[PDB]
Ligand binder design. Structure first.
Ligand SMILES: COc1ccccc1COCCCOc1ccc(N2C(=O)CNC[C@H]2COc2ccc3c(c2)NCCC3)cc1
Length: 329
């Protein structure tokens, strides 16, 4: 077992540090169970790409261990199609060193990569969804047969450690009660069946069922715009330019949102999904939820991000293709 300390940036971004190359080129990265690739901006990334001007660039010509590949990797992020090329090098993750192939982004839109406090993504997803079919970092750690267990866990603190990922297990110090596991529907994705979503006292959503992407990478909880337009209106959520809000002084009265997974009800009190910046009546306060129309095969599917994870310590169990959730502590 190895644990990676995470920095919690305004409850929207939880990222850690990986070292890449010889010598180790440090990168602040989000460990994303929603993606299966390692992406870091390339030193080859044109200075024109703003996301690159203000971010740690990986310089291959600075690493003695670098193993060129060149294979161009691409992925459209409904904001722009980012592109880089495949590269190989030793990546250190919480004391664990692994030869890992990753993408160096050479081209990527400002939004939202420009606002990232971190420089890259450590895809924790499955290889089934790894662009270029590149073997994921954790699959690469598993291969080492050093981890005490084929699982990694997430602890996203409620700001102020900012968070904590445990490679190989889970930290009892960060959850309480017991893990209630939901199985992974389609294998190859950290997604589980969801028996509806409730609003205070009314199962008026996801009725009949729906899918939930347990995305450690997503800042918020999301679902099809339909579900969110429904949900947000049912809360009194008055939509803004993008995210929905609600008068601060009225955030504490908003009803409890619950997600049904594994025969257990996962409730988010209003203090769980509202960014209670203040309690004034004049200022508006945002909700840790938004509409994310995720495209198939995985989508449409709700996505339980940091908002969800913050309250429920999460465990991604590979060996058993299931996800554990326990009261984050
Ligand atoms: C980390 O993104 C970068 C930032 C600067 C420079 C280079 C990169 C990576 O290259 C870009 C190529 C790969 O880019 C992505 C990789 C993974 C994703 N995700 C998924 O596929 C599924 N779920 C969640 C996300 C991870 O969470 C994210 C990603 C970006 C942001 C936030 C959260 N939060 C706020 C700041 C931006 C999105 C984009």
């Amino acid at each position: 077992t190895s644990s990676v300390i995470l920095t919690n940036y305004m409850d929207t971004q939880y990222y850690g540090e990986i070292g890449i190359g010889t010598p180790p080129q440090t990168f602040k990265v989000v460990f994303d169970t929603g993606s299966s690739n390692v992406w870091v901006p390339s030193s080859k990334c044109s200075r024109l790409y703003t996301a690159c001007v203000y971010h740690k660039l990986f310089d291959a010509s600075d690493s003695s261990s670098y193993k060129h590949n060149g294979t161009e990797l691409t992925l459209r992020y409904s904001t722009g199609t980012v592109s880089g090329f495949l590269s190989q090098d030793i990546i250190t993750v919480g004391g664990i060193t692994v030869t890992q192939m990753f993408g160096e982004v050479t081209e990527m839109p400002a939004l939202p990569f420009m606002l990232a406090e971190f420089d890259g993504v450590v895809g924790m997803g499955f290889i089934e969804q790894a662009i270029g079919r590149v073997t994921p970092i954790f699959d690469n750690i598993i291969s080492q047969g050093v981890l005490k267990e084929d699982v990694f866990s997430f602890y996203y603190n409620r700001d102020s450690l900012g968070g904590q990922i445990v490679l190989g297990g889970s930290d009892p110090q960060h959850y309480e009660g017991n893990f209630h596991y939901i199985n992974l529907i389609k294998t190859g994705v950290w997604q589980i069946q969801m028996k509806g979503v409730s609003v205070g006292s009314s199962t008026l959503l996801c009725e009949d069922g729906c899918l939930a992407l347990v995305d450690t990478g997503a800042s918020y909880i999301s679902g099809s715009t339909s579900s969110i337009e429904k949900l947000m209106e049912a809360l009194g959520a008055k939509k803004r330019l993008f995210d929905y809000v609600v008068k601060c002084n009225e955030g504490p009265t908003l009803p409890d949102i619950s997600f049904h997974l594994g025969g257990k009800e996962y409730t988010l009190t209003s203090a769980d999904y509202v960014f209670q910046e203040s309690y004034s009546s004049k200022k508006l306060c945002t909700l840790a939820i938004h509409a994310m129309d995720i495209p198939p095969p995985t989508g449409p599917t709700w996505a339980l991000g940091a908002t969800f994870i913050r309250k429920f310590y999460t465990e991604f169990d590979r060996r058993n293709n299931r996800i554990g959730f326990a009261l984050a502590r």
